[PDB]
Write an enzyme that holds these catalytic residues in place. Structure first.
Site, short mmCIF file in Angstrom:
data_model
loop_
_atom_site.label_atom_id
_atom_site.label_comp_id
_atom_site.label_asym_id
_atom_site.label_seq_id
_atom_site.Cartn_x
_atom_site.Cartn_y
_atom_site.Cartn_z
N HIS A 47 9.45 0.17 -11.75
CA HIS A 47 8.50 0.65 -11.30
C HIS A 47 9.06 2.20 -10.53
CE1 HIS A 47 10.68 0.33 -6.83
NE2 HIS A 47 11.12 -0.26 -7.33
N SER A 171 15.58 1.47 -5.14
CA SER A 171 15.03 0.46 -6.19
C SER A 171 15.63 1.86 -7.37
CB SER A 171 13.63 1.63 -6.84
OG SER A 171 13.15 0.71 -4.90
#
Length: 215
Positions: A47, A171
């Site tokens: 992502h 992330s």
């Protein structure tokens, strides 16, 4: 997500392993964490490099291994190529939410890089998640590495879950075991923000990484 009281602490020395191999990585519109896994390869989240909703790759930026107090204490490299699993492109599912980035120079030979251990079960294993959260950037005004350790509390066949605190920017942080081997990669909050988790180093994870290492 940050769950209850924040348990993260600032990494004191980013000139030693494994912290020197954990990088602040930038894109044209965001930043993430990544971990060197070869001379010129970084592991992060899918992502971070590809947006499912816009069907768009991120604009390429730069890689700063063991940045601390906004200082590139181990130098820097640029991003040159992205490798993303077909399954992530096609479904955007958490089980495929990982990716590899090639750098323009072999920065992994200066600081070192981490190996990946294929796993079946992580429940009960203590892992460490260290990376570059955005909330600490706001509050200290500096880009520094923050870490926290805890146990894997549950899992399914592709994902592992934990209450270790994370925030946007984390992330792509590796899940590191006691021997500094990568066993998975943090990607998100789950269960309406009551636990965190991400993809484990399954056989499918390891196959894609092996292909990416050869590019």
């Amino acid at each position: 997500v940050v769950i209850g009281d924040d348990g993260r602490t600032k990494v004191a020395n980013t000139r030693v392993a494994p912290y020197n191999s954990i990088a602040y990585i930038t894109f044209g519109g965001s930043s993430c964490t990544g971990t060197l896994i070869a001379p010129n390869k970084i592991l992060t989240n899918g992502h971070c490099v590809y947006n499912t909703a816009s069907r768009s790759y991120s604009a390429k930026g730069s890689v700063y291994p063991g940045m601390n107090d906004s200082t590139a204490v181990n130098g820097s490299a640029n991003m040159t190529e992205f490798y993303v699993p077909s399954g992530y492109i096609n479904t955007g599912a958490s089980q495929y939410d990982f990716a590899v980035i090639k750098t323009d120079t072999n920065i992994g030979n200066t600081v070192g890089y981490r190996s990946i251990r294929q796993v079946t079960n992580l429940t009960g294993t203590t892992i460490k998640i260290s990376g570059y959260p955005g909330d600490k950037m706001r509050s200290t005004g500096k880009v520094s590495q923050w870490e926290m350790s805890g146990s894997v509390t549950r899992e399914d066949t592709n994902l592992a879950y934990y209450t270790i605190d994370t925030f946007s920017g984390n992330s792509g942080s590796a899940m590191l075991d006691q021997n500094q081997q990568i066993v998975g990669v943090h990607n998100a909050g789950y269960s309406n923000g009551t636990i965190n988790g991400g993809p484990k180093a399954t056989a499918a994870f390891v196959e894609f990484i092996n292909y990416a290492k050869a590019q």
